[PDB]
Structure 1
Amino acid sequence: CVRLHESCLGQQVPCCDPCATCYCRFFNAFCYCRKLGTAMNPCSRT
């Protein structure tokens, strides 16, 4: 998988971090792992 917060180029490389998924900051360029900014119910982010 990908690192904690890096590019996954292709969107086929899911984040190696639990509850973490690659997201693109734009159309298709800034696609990197994301730990989900769920301040209400965050997963693995301590």
Structure 2
Amino acid sequence: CVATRNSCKPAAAACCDPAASCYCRFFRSACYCR
């Protein structure tokens, strides 16, 4: 869905890529594409 550590989703950190998977940090309340 997104490149990496940029913008998993157009609003926060929520990737869509099936093979990939962001990382929930909580600091911002979301999961960034590590």
- Structure possessing the higher radius of gyration over alpha carbons: 1
Q: TM-score range by the shorter chain?
A: 0.3 to 0.5
TM-score by length of 1: 0.34
More strand by percentage: 1
